[PDB]
Structure 1
Amino acid sequence: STFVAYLPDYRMQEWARREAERLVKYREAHGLPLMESNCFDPSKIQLPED
């Protein structure tokens, strides 16, 4: 139980918080939106003709 309690950052669950703590402080500072609606950049993706 001591080994399980002191696991070194399991599944980087803490780290994903801390990086997010940086990232918001980026996009709130420069007026960017918090999250874009597209996961990937729309300029680098080609759609079939329809």
Structure 2
Amino acid sequence: GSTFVAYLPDYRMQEWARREAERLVKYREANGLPLMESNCFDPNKIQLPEDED
């Protein structure tokens, strides 16, 4: 059981996440983009309510 748990396949996607982050950093560094962004969602697809107060 200990051997089985030790060799459990990476279904939590840690290696996948690191590879995705590596390629994303490689792209953003080369293209001059500001690494991570402050907005998690695209502001253009958010309709804010006007206050007009």
State the TM-score bracket (shorter-chain normalisation): 0.7 to 0.9
TM-score by length of 1: 0.85
CA RMSD of aligned residues (A): 1.4
Extract structure 1 runs of 4+ deviating beyond 3 A: none
Compute the displacement of 1:7 (Å): 1.1
Which has the greater radius of gyration?
2
Aligned length: 50
Q: Deviations over 1:9-46 (max 9, x none)?
A: 14112211111011100100100011111001111100
Q: More displaced, 18-27 or 6-15? A: 6-15
Give structure 2 stretches of 5+ with no counterpart. Answer: none
Unaligned regions of 5+ residues in structure 1, if any? none
Give the TM-score, by structure 2 length.
0.81
